[PDB]
């Protein structure tokens, strides 16, 4: 007698032809290479923040001799802060028996994991290292991009030499420094930093198979066809999901209060673009034999270098004139 929402009214919904029904006798991989899906959106969008992990950065060890050892993992602190304290420990500035007129130093340094280095910001790409080689012209600049990949070990050994006091005692000190790319040192009788290889599975947030079925609830379902892969969960269907945001009890309402909050969230996302990790992208191969994309055989040398006489069709073979089809099956 008045407007009551119906319950069981939905018509059939037209089913479209599948690519097998429409294009048999052709490459299956067409309808099986699915669309790309960038993961990095999701963790930002649907709110995954990695737990703050706080691993070790450096370490100081003594022996019954006078000799002390200073150990560093360059993947955990920045480069400069690692290099300041080296020059502060390599001398003995923490050792209260410090005379700068000493011909002898019982302080030794070790470094490890020099491949991966922390550089806060957009500095691994822009900053450079310059020098001159006696001859005219000269003035060779080089990028961190060269060191951080090919030989990153001059860099750590080059920045130390700039913080140390400019004198003759330097070489004796820098003779007592050692760097490694791997996660080890070869010395024996000393410890080694454990690497952090794990990566947080965020699976508990977007997967029922991780949780137990009795803790969960179904609030909505489309079909009368119920999956067998989902069995044991209740069905307490809300009357509330399908209601748009006007027909509900609580409405989010733009207002001087929430708009004031809106602007706080807006600065947050601008205030975070600054705290973003940039990476040296690697060089690239363009072998057509590897990619899933199409390509061109513009020239002849692209054949020999890649052995593409196969996928090229011979010239001694007929052609295809017109491939229209009138009737589309169902």
């Amino acid at each position: 007698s008045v407007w009551k929402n119906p319950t069981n009214y939905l018509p059939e919904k037209a089913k479209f032809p599948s690519p097998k029904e429409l294009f048999p006798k052709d490459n299956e991989n067409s309808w099986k290479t699915l669309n790309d899906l960038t993961p990095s959106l999701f963790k930002d969008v649907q709110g995954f923040k990695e737990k703050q992990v706080q691993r070790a950065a450096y370490m100081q060890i003594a022996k019954p001799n006078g000799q002390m050892y200073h150990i560093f993992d360059a993947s955990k602190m920045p480069l400069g802060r690692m290099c300041q304290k080296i020059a502060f420990f390599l001398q003995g500035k923490h050792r209260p028996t410090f005379k700068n007129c000493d011909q002898v130093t019982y302080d030794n340094i070790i470094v490890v994991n020099a491949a991966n280095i922390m550089l806060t910001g957009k500095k691994a790409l822009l900053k450079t290292v310059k020098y001159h080689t006696g001859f005219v012209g000269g003035l060779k600049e080089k990028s961190y991009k060269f060191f951080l990949t090919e030989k990153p070990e001059q860099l750590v050994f080059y920045c130390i030499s700039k913080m140390l006091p400019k004198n003759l005692k330097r070489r004796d000190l820098l003779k007592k420094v050692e760097i490694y790319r791997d996660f080890q040192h070869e010395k024996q009788g000393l410890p080694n930093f454990v690497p952090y290889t794990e990566k947080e599975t965020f699976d508990q947030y977007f997967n029922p198979f991780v949780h137990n079925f009795e803790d969960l609830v179904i609030k909505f379902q489309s079909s009368k066809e119920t999956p067998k892969e989902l069995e044991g969960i209740k069905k307490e269907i809300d009357p509330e999901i399908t209601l748009p945001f006007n027909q509900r009890s609580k409405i989010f309402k733009l207002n001087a209060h929430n708009r004031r909050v809106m602007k706080q969230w807006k600065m947050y996302y601008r205030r975070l673009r600054r705290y973003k990790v940039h990476k040296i992208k690697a060089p690239k191969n363009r072998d057509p034999n590897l990619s899933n994309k199409s390509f061109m055989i513009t020239s002849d040398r692209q054949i020999k270098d890649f052995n593409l006489h196969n996928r090229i069709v011979p010239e001694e073979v007929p052609e295809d004139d017109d491939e229209i089809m009138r009737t589309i099956p169902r």
């Binding site: 407007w3 929402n5 009214y9 479209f16 229209i324």
Partner: protein
């Protein structure tokens, strides 16, 4: 002022919505209040709109059906497709993407048959 000489043509990218239709049937309950007016506006866009971008045999109607559960928008396309969309809960925007989900495919069906269902470039400039 000054005379344009670069002519930017935008006729081929023109993709209206009701173009692949053969007919339509509005359905109205006088007890709806949200599902009436949505169907009012569609019936205008079926006739108030331009006939170039429609078929030749396009006939839209309107009927008051008290017996229905909800007011509906039934439709029929060229190559066989047929559907109904009740309107007591939806919007005008949720409907259009359904129409694109058909109109985008009928091109993939008719182009394979050889039919040029596209427009000249000179129809609408910027």
């Amino acid at each position: 002022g000054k005379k344009r000489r670069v002519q930017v043509f935008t006729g081929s990218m023109l993709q209206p919505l009701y173009r692949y239709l053969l007919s339509a049937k509005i359905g109205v309950n006088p007890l709806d209040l949200h599902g009436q007016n949505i169907a009012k506006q569609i019936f205008l866009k079926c006739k108030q709109a331009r006939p170039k971008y429609l078929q030749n045999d396009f006939n839209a109607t309107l009927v008051q059906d008290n017996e229905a559960p909800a007011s509906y928008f039934h439709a029929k396309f060229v190559n066989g497709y047929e559907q109904k969309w009740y309107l007591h809960k939806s919007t005008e925007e949720e409907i259009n993407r359904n129409l694109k989900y058909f109109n985008y495919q009928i091109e993939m069906e008719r182009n394979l048959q050889g039919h040029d269902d596209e427009y000249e470039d000179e129809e609408t400039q910027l």
